Design a protein around this ligand. Structure first.
Ligand SMILES: *[C@@H]1O[C@H](CO)[C@@H](O)[C@H](O)[C@H]1NC(C)=O
Ligand SMILES: [Ca+2]
Ligand SMILES: [Ca+2]
Length: 402
């Protein structure tokens, strides 16, 4: 009713000077952002409120992004730590139980096994290695020394003195270790992408659009009004479009990542080789000492649910939950922090007629609330899309045994 007392309240409680707000409505000819009409807002008040709304949206965005980063980091640490512990507990179990069973056979060769575990370790960490060739070399030297303590051209390979254990170990390790490494690496790349995209600032366009969205209701004399859901969604879809462009490759990455988890195990019944290597080694040694005089001429059931299995289930739940993130941002921010027949449509309290825009940069060309340039995409987002592409390629090749 042309008394600005309510607006004076809100402006003052937001920590701005009460000096600048008039007692009655004045001509809004001076308004740059808000639709020109009789208003309680001074230009001062207008730019201040715009700045504030901008800051608020930024804070929201960074909050969401930080939540996502937190989740991804947690998953990363979890899987890395568990893989490494599995390898490690395998080695320590080997060191503990081997001298008893195999005696001097292991006792004299221990450096070979230690070195092998070191090789597997370096491989998981992403060093360049041919695991096939490494294992082959290992079996060659080990066979040499073992044959020497049992009592050049070697007939031995193709006479399979160690049995099927070397083959099993080769296949299983080759699959599982590249699976694990690729998965962890994928988590890392996801985290980095989110962290880098969070840094991309909002433009002046988005600023004026958000100001018109939020506090222009107050300026035009209807401060009790809160934005219509479709209005807010259009404004945010216009602001976040470049971020929305990440959707495709984000989804591809996450899909390939929930795909690669299946390769942590071979086909059914046997526990993952990643923690069970020592076991196949023992199998091989036993098979050799079984073949000792002809040459002179333990892989336990998989538990119904194991640690790695539970971690994988939880992780797949998380990834399935966050796959829609980039396009889910506007609805999420609008639902939680930004917003009953009559609501603020931006010219008055009423209905918002305009149809909601589609996702992505290109779809914002006709966006009524915000003016967006679709010709030049944000190239940071583009960089990150490239990263997603590359990591996805790595994971797809890893899934194919490549
Ligand atoms: C397991 O093995 C390596 C070798 O010392 C070590 O760096 C790592 O910290 C150990 N602990 C775990 C669970 O990573
Ligand atoms: Ca979701
Ligand atoms: Ca336009």
């Amino acid at each position: 009713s042309r008394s600005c007392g309510e607006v004076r309240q809100i402006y003052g409680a937001k920590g701005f000077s009460l000096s600048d707000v008039p007692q009655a409505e004045i001509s809004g000819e001076h308004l740059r952002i808000c639709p020109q009409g009789y208003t309680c807002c001074t230009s001062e008040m207008e730019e201040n409120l715009a700045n504030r709304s901008h800051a608020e949206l930024e804070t929201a965005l960074r909050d969401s992004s930080r939540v996502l980063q937190a989740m991804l980091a947690t998953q990363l640490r979890s899987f890395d730590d568990h893989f490494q512990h599995l390898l490690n507990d395998s080695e320590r179990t080997l060191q503990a139980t081997f001298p008893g069973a195999f005696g001097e056979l292991y006792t004299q060769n221990a450096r070979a096994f230690r070195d092998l575990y070191s090789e597997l370790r370096l491989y998981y960490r992403g060093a360049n290695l041919h695991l096939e060739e490494t294992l082959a070399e290992f079996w060659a030297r080990l066979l040499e020394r073992l044959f020497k303590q049992l009592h050049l051209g070697k007939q031995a390979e193709a006479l399979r003195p160690f049995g099927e254990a070397p083959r099993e170990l080769r296949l299983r390790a080759t699959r599982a270790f590249v699976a694990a490494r690729s998965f962890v690496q994928g988590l890392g790349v996801a985290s980095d992408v989110v962290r880098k995209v969070a840094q991309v600032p909002l433009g002046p366009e988005c600023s004026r659009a958000v100001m018109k969205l939020v506090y222009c209701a107050h300026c035009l004399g209807v401060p009790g009004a809160r934005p219509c859901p479709d209005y807010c969604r259009n404004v945010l879809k216009g602001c976040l479009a470049n971020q929305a462009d990440l959707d495709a490759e984000w989804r591809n990455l996450l899909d390939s990542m929930v795909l690669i988890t299946d390769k942590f195990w071979g086909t059914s019944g046997v526990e993952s080789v990643i923690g069970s290597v020592h076991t196949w080694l023992a199998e091989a040694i036993n098979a050799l000492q079984d073949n000792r005089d002809t040459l002179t001429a333990a892989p336990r059931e998989r538990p119904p649910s194991g640690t790695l299995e539970k971690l994988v289930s939880e992780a797949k739940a998380q990834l399935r939950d966050v796959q829609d993130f980039w396009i889910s941002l506007p609805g999420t921010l609008c639902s939680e922090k930004m917003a009953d027949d009559r609501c603020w449509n931006g010219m008055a309290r009423g209905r918002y007629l305009p149809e909601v825009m589609g996702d992505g940069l290109a779809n914002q060309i006709n966006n009524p609330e915000v003016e967006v340039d679709i010709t030049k995409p944000d190239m940071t987002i583009r960089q990150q899309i490239m990263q997603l592409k590359i990591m996805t390629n790595r994971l797809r090749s890893a899934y194919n045994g490549n």
